[PDB]
Amino acid sequence: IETVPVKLKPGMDGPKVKQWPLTEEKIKALVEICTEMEKEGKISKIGPENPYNTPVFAIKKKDSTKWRKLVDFRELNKRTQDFWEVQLGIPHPAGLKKKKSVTVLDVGDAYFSVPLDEDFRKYTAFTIPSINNETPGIRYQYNVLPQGWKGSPAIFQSSMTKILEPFKKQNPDIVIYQYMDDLYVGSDLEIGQHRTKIEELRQHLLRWGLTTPDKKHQKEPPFLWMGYELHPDKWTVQPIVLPEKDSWTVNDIQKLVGKLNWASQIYPGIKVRQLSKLLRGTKALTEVIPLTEEAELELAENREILKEPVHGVYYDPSKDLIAEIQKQGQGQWTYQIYQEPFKNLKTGKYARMRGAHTNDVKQLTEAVQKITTESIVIWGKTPKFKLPIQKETWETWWTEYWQATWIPEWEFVNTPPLVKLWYQ
């Protein structure tokens, strides 16, 4: 079938990125895998004349006992953006967040049969590193369309659209989105028949040559949740809560006034005047002080204005999406996705099982994956994260808990201030 020509943006070179040191375990995985992968003609060994490199990590497939190779293709994506956005770019439907059930599938095993452009094969070069710098790593480049590259679904897009047609014909209430290796299927059906419809689609792709490893626990799951299933109808910007108290004290009112004054940046219609005068005299923090009529007026007013959506908040396709996660303790994490400050496109909170299962880094990682997934569902791309974690730590343990095929951009904040319970 030959190849679609792939050119970088004029004035840009191929990716040169250092390779992270890896556990001997992960190295054995990336050796075995790449060995059989070489035997299947998917990849080949290169020479010293190929300066390019891209990172490679070893993860778990989903819950599986067998390993999985995860390439970080980011820097290549930044330099190929003309190919998979401008020219061959895949459109994102804005109505996927509208449906009540969205099931995600892994179609990434399709690209492995499609040949990659010969002149572009040198850019996909990756290195399997060794221990204690015994030798430089084992070099490989991609002969086929690589998983994780944004150009792969862009090329495969035609074939994909051809395969999904007999399915889209039978039920044109269903909207399907393709983001890289993932197929997001939206529906309005009942859960019971939704899962079955999904199985119809799965066997449809399965009989046309796309073998998706979404084969689940077969018949009887021991203890686990079958599908990966979201519900975007419950995804919206969450309101701010002013803690309800029978009797108010001085310090409670101080925290209240402070919080409201913070809320005055997103809501110009906030007045603390009637709450500022009640604290006028300098009293003890623990002294119990009842509210007045003016104060209650000012409370009931700002309780009403707080549950209204912010006026004039619109998504800008030119600007990047930016996410912030802050740690609330007790396995709960709060997050906001904004483009410009104080304009919050999406807000929410993520929590986990209570018991000894999960720890900090695990919770954070899973949180990142969740927020990213929601962002993909809504605006059609991944937000850049500001992460509340030490850089070298996250750079170490993030792969352990990462089950996703993609890797969103991130950076690490050492500050974050009094904003803790303000978002709680």
Partner 1 sequence: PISPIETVPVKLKPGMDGPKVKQWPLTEEKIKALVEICTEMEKEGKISKIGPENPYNTPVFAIKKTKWRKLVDFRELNKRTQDFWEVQLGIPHPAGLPKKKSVTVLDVGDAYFSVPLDEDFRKYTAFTIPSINNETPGIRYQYNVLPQGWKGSPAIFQSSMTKILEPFAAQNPDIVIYQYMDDLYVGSDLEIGQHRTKIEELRQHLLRWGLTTPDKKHQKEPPFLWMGYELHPDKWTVQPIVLPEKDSWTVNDIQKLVGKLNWASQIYPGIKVRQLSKLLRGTKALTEVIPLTEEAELELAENREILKEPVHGVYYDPSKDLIAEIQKQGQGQWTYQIYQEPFKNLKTGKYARMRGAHTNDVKQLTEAVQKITTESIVIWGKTPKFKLPIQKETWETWWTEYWQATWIPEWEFVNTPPLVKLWYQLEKEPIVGAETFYVDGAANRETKLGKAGYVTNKGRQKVVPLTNTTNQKTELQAIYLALQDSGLEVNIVTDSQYALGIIQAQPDKSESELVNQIIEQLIKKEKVYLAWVPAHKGIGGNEQ
Q: List contacts with partner 1 (CB under 8 A).
A: 21-24, 27, 47-51, 53, 131-136, 139, 251, 254-255, 257-258, 261, 272, 276, 279-280, 282-286, 326-327, 329, 359-361, 363-364, 388-390, 392-393, 396-397, 414, 416-418, 420
* Pairing assessment for the beta strands 410-412 and 384-387 based on DSSP bridges: parallel
By beta-carbon proximity to partner 1, the closer residue of 24 and 63 is: 24
Contact 351, 333 (CB under 8 A): yes
Contact 107, 206 (CB under 8 A): no
C-alpha 301/C-alpha 402 separation (Å) is 45
By beta-carbon proximity to partner 1, the closer residue of 131 and 297 is: 131
Q: Which residues pair with 337 in a beta bridge?
A: 323, 346
Give the number of other Cβ atoms within 10 Å of residue 311's Cβ.
8
By beta-carbon proximity to partner 1, the closer residue of 134 and 246 is: 134
Residue 30 φ then ψ, to 5°: -70, -10
By beta-carbon proximity to partner 1, the closer residue of 79 and 216 is: 79
Task: Name the minimum Å distance from CB 284 to partner 1.
Answer: 5
Task: Name the minimum Å distance from CB 349 to partner 1.
Answer: 15
C-alpha 414/C-alpha 126 separation (Å) is 32
Task: Name the minimum Å distance from CB 3 to partner 1.
Answer: 21
Distances (CA, A) of 264 to 32, 258, 304, 310: 58, 10, 14, 12
What strands, in cross-sheet order, belong to the sheet with 410-412?
344-351, 332-338, 322-329, 384-387, 410-412
Closest CA relative to residue 25, chosen from 57, 62, 73, 54: 57
**181 marked as part of a ligand binding site:** yes
By beta-carbon proximity to partner 1, the closer residue of 108 and 331 is: 331
By beta-carbon proximity to partner 1, the closer residue of 64 and 359 is: 359
Task: Name the minimum Å distance from CB 77 to partner 1.
Answer: 21
Residue 98 φ then ψ, to 5°: -75, -35
By beta-carbon proximity to partner 1, the closer residue of 306 and 313 is: 306
Closest CA relative to residue 153, chosen from 51, 65, 219, 80: 80
**188 marked as part of a ligand binding site:** no
**182 marked as part of a ligand binding site:** yes
Closest CA relative to residue 365, chosen from 319, 410, 415, 304: 410
Going by the annotation, the residues of the binding site for Mg(2+) are 106, 181-182
